[PDB]
From Swiss-Prot:
The gene is CPA1. One of its GO terms (molecular function) is metallocarboxypeptidase activity. Monomer. May form a complex with proelastase 2. The keyword Phosphoprotein does not apply. Carboxypeptidase that catalyzes the release of a C-terminal amino acid, but has little or no action with -Asp, -Glu, -Arg, -Lys or -Pro. Catalyzes the conversion of leukotriene C4 to leukotriene F4 via the hydrolysis of an amide bond. It is found in: Secreted. It catalyses: Release of a C-terminal amino acid, but little or no action with -Asp, -Glu, -Arg, -Lys or -Pro; leukotriene C4 + H2O = leukotriene F4 + glycine. This is Carboxypeptidase A1. Zn(2+) binds at residues 67, 70, 194. Its EC number is 3.4.17.1. Binds 1 zinc ion per subunit. Keywords: Carboxypeptidase, Disulfide bond, Hydrolase, Metal-binding, Metalloprotease, Protease, Secreted, Signal, Zinc, Zymogen. The chain holds residues 113 to 417 of 419 of the full protein. Substrate binds at residues 67-70, 125, 142-143, 195-196, 246.
Length: 305
């Protein structure tokens, strides 16, 4: 049961996939599992849909683990999934959100790379797509989106960790999300989870031009970092991607924002470099707890209060 599943340790790809089947079996009144595509190697790509009814209700997209090595993200996603099922009908605020909006959660956005971090390279970041012309494998899925694709902030060299691929959406793991979100057409928030650095970022990453909704998103971001900090005092910096980290092209939130999805944010979770990607399992639950308060604040702003 999801009640005996250990949320305080890291899991394999199959354990997480089995957890998904368990959650759907236990809470059919709220969650269902969708296969939106298959990875380069043929692994199914799954999205959990949380909904209380309706026809094409406004939605919130949340993806985790696009960069496979960022294990704290998939772990936070599993906990989030459990959280949603416990809080509905309990937390008055979250209850109002699910009563008028659907939440789409993608725990393992890059399954091939995730399997690879467990079998061969713990620090693997990219997908596992093969390019016959190179001995190097993979494309950085967060440089593959049609948002300033091929511009500064990504590399054209296949061996680079930030290789953008041959063309925008070349990676099936990316195309499957683009297609799904576009066909859906009613997403109001697009949240992508990463690690590490402790930053809450909004568009743009590919250009220094300010998004027209700059002042609003910056206020929402300030509110979200305040709420997250309240719990354990964890401090986050926030701002546009280009001014807060560096210029980065072909990123997902830049693409989602240009698709009319206003509340597009990227979270860079714990820590700031002590452990980096190898965050100890003892910090899983705490990280998941604080990030939740931050995420919820953004959602309340999308239902509009
Ligand atoms: O990242
Ligand atoms: Zn990342
Ligand atoms: Zn990052």
């Amino acid at each position: 049961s999801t009640n005996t599943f250990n949320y305080a340790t890291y899991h394999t790809l199959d354990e997480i996939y089995d957890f998904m089947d368990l959650l759907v079996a236990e809470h059919p009144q709220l969650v269902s599992k969708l296969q939106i595509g298959r990875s380069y190697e043929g692994r199914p790509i799954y999205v959990l849909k949380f909904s209380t009814g309706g026809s094409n209700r406004p939605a919130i997209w949340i993806d985790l683990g696009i960069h496979s090595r960022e294990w704290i993200t998939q772990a936070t996603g599993v906990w989030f999934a459990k959280k949603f099922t416990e809080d509905y009908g309990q937390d008055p605020s979250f209850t109002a959100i699910l009563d008028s909006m659907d939440i789409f959660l993608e725990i393992v956005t890059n399954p091939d790379g995730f399997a690879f971090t467990h079998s061969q390279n713990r620090l693997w970041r990219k997908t596992r797509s093969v390019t016959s012309s190179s001995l190097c494998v993979g494309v950085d899925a967060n440089r593959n989106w049609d948002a300033g694709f091929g511009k500064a902030g990504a590399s054209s060299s296949p061996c680079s960790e930030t290789y953008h691929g041959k063309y925008a959406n070349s990676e099936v793991e990316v195309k499957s999300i683009v297609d799904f979100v576009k066909d859906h057409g009613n997403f109001k928030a697009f949240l992508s989870i990463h690690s590490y650095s402790q930053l809450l970022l909004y568009p743009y990453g590919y250009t220094t031009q300010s998004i027209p909704d700059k002042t609003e998103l910056n206020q929402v971001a300030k509110s979200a970092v305040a709420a997250l900090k309240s719990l354990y005092g964890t401090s986050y910096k926030y701002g546009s991607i280009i001014t807060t980290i560096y210029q980065a092209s072909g990123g997902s939130i830049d693409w989602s924002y240009n698709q009319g999805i206003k509340y597009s944010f990227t979270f860079e979770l714990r820590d700031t470099g002590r452990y980096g990607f190898l965050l100890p399992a003892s910090q899983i639950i705490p990280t998941a707890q604080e990030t939740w308060l931050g995420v919820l604040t953004i959602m309340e702003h999308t239902v509009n209060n």
